[PDB]
């Protein structure tokens, strides 16, 4: 299986960016397999 990389852009902040998304505060746990889960 051939896995390969292609350049897609510079790493730059853009002043004219679309703005969206909430900012939730969540209690979570991280297990040994790298999986996040919710905690209550």
């Amino acid at each position: 299986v051939d896995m390969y990389i292609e350049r897609a852009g510079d790493i730059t902040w853009e002043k004219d960016a679309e703005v969206t998304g909430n900012s939730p505060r969540l209690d979570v746990a991280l297990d040994e397999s790298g999986d996040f889960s919710l905690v209550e």
């Binding site: 896995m3 390969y4 902040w13 679309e18 703005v19 969206t20 996040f36």
Partner: protein, 148 residues
């Protein structure tokens, strides 16, 4: 080897993820490549460091990215979705509260092939990578950063 954001492709062809070239090291999420070697033109990139619990991997050298969210400011996801040009999405992170401390998190839901896309602070530094997270039905991604 040029600095920048890159698609991670597999063979038809499919985009499985994204990563960051900086200081001669390629950075992506472990679940994107599972540590497989990567082709870059006529060259080969071999894995150098990786960790399943952090869900991170670096190629060619040690993890270079060390900036962190300041906990107050908006950030930008530099999303590179499959079949789309790289684009910047600005957001205020929420927070993952864990027993070991708080982690910034972005409530943005892009196609799986976008995993590994960098999240940037206002100075353009990479504060982490997108694509390891939780569902609340909306997906929320940790801002995952390694250690330099």
């Amino acid at each position: 080897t040029t600095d920048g954001v890159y698609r991670v492709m597999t063979r038809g062809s499919t985009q499985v993820g994204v990563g960051v070239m900086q200081e001669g090291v390629f950075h992506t999420m472990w679940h994107v490549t599972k540590g497989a070697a990567l082709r870059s033109g006529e060259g080969r990139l071999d894995p150098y460091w990786g960790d399943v619990k952090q869900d991170l991997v670096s190629y060619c050298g040690p993890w270079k990215l060390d900036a962190a969210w300041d906990g107050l400011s908006e950030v930008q996801l530099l999303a590179v979705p499959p079949g789309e040009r790289a684009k910047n999405i600005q957001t205020l992170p929420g927070i993952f509260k864990t027993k070991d401390g708080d982690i910034g998190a972005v409530a943005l839901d892009y196609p799986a092939g976008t995993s590994g896309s960098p999240i940037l602070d206002k100075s353009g530094r990479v504060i982490g990578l997108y694509g390891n997270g939780v569902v609340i039905g909306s997906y929320v991604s940790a801002i995952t950063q390694g250690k330099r």
